[model samples]
Every structure is written in structure tokens, then in C-alpha cells.
Target: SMSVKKPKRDDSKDLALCSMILTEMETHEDAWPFLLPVNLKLVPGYKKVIKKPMDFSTIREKLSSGQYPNLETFALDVRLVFDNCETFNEDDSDIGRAGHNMRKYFEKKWTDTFK
Candidate 1:
């Protein structure tokens, strides 16, 4: 049997999916609390982190152009990063909910959104 290579992904449906997921987190009380930095003293860093409920266009453009760096590492880390952290281990933890749920949301609704 010939080994089949996976087809390349081309889901216009999910072109804006990351934006959608981020928007959900925006309205949620958990969003800000969840985005609370590891060190609040780090230049009040949440400004760089938090954004309005809309297109996160820059990263979207990068990933769309097949130029996103360290993506493989990010994918792995997204799943396993919480393994060592007691705080983020909870599915409801702020970072956990924001990141994990975003991953899941894209996977779950990808095809359906365009249909």
C-alpha cells in the first residue's frame, strides 16, 4: 500500500476563526482574569496581550502565507504546556480557557462555519 500524504489545508471558512474565538473570550469575565500576566509588574504587559473583538489580522496573514515560524513547536506546546503548571492545569484557568478553547473551537467548527 502506498502511504498517502495528507492534503494541504485550505479552509476559507476558518480564515477568521481565530478572530471569532478571541471575541468570545473578550466578552467573558474570564478573559481579562485569564490573560493576567505571570508577572503583573512586567511593564503592565496585558496591553500587548488583550485586544478588541475583531480580526487578529497580522498573525492571520502570516499563517495564511505559510510563513508562520515555530508553528510546530507552538502546536505541541499548546497541548502540553499546562502539564507542568498547577494553575494553568485547570481547563478553566484563564490562559487555559483562552488558548485551549481557541484551539478546540477552530477544530470543532471549521467545516461547519463555511457550510
Candidate 2:
């Protein structure tokens, strides 16, 4: 006797495929001006240690290039740097200071580049 096997259903795979299809159908151009910095900050350790000084020039160089210095490698570097930095407890004041510094850096770099 011959037996027929049913197709396996994976919700995650189905969701991914549906998302891809929807993304492809969308026509609007999305601008990712701050994607590089945002992505870099997503790494666990770097997210905290990088508060004091935020570098945007290096971020621009990494993001705009078609070849060499891809985002994945850049993220890895950020993670490594974070790993090497010593951790410290942060207060609200310190958080505010870091946020201000990062915002200034991002605005300056963005204006210079877009101008």
C-alpha cells in the first residue's frame, strides 16, 4: 500500500513569506538616514558604553558604501568594542547627557551630508 504525506505547516515560515510578499508590493521609497547608528546601538554592551561620544562620520562611511564594511561586520565591531568597555551604573542625568550628545552628533552629521 502507498501512503501520502501531508505538507508541514510552519507559522513562522508562513508569516515570513507573507511579510516578504507585502514588502515587495509596497512602492514607496523609505529613507533610512539614521539606520546605521540605530542598528549599531542595538548591540547589547555598545548600547550603554557608547553614550558619551557618538560618532556619525564613521557611521556614514559604513552605510553609504556598496562594497566593503558591510552592516553585519560593523555591528560585530560595535559589539566587540562594547565587550571591551568597562560597565558603570548610569543615572537619569547621565542618560540625558548622553542622549543630548548623540542627538547633536546625529543632527550635525545629517545636515552636513544632506546639504
Candidate 3:
């Protein structure tokens, strides 16, 4: 009988998929607020409110720099961005709605690509 059918180790494939996802996310229409870190000076108390403020630009750098060892790690940061948004903004607000949209897009893409 066959044992657990784990996914084959394919770093190149994983890296490419991660890059593709990041590119699409960066280009997403709802990506504006998440393109970069929140301007600390502009958003006073933001640092206090959100300890780990994840953003697309930061994730892109991490992906390119090989800091993300696997897809799961990459996904963690992506989810972080959305979670942070939800934490920082009201659900009925513009940014909050965009965060929901982006999260939906990412989850769908993730399932379509790997699941």
C-alpha cells in the first residue's frame, strides 16, 4: 500500500507561484492601501495598534530575498496584511472593504493554484 502522498519538493515551482501571487496582489485595484507600510507619521498610534504591519512591498522583498522558505510562510504574511487591515480599519470603511476583496482574491487563487 502507498504511504502518505506528500507534495514533491519543488522550490522553483513554489518560488514562481509565490512571485506570481505577489505580482497579482501588487497590481490588484485594492492594493493601494497595502502597497507599502503605513506612514507612521501620518497614522499616529498605528504602531501601537498594529504590532506587525504587513504589506505587499514588504512581502515582495521577503519573497525575492528568499526569506520565505515555503508557500505556507509566504501565505502567512499575505494573510497578515488582510488581518492587519481588518484590525486597523472599520469593516464598512473603504480600506476595510478593499482588504476583504483582496483576501477573497488571494484565498481563491491559493486554492485554485495548489489545492
How would you encode candidate 1's per-residue C-alpha lDDT over 32-98 as one tens digit per residue?
4333324435635333543321223333444456553443432333233223232334666665565
Error of 1 at 92 (Å): 11
Identify the superior model by TM-score, candidate 1 or candidate 2: 1
lDDT of each: 0.42, 0.36, 0.92
Cα lDDT, model 2, residue 18: 29
lDDT of 3: 0.92
Q: What global local distance difference test value does model 1 have?
A: 0.42
Model 2, 1-115: lDDT tens digits are 2587688544334333323322322221221222234454456565555564322334334434532233344334333322223233232445334434444443454344333
| Every model: Cα RMSD to truth | 8.2, 14.4, 2.9
Ten contiguous residues minimizing lDDT sum, candidate 3: 1-10
Cα RMSD for candidate 2?
Answer: 14.4
Best-fitting candidate, scored by TM-score: 3
Winning candidate number (lDDT):
3
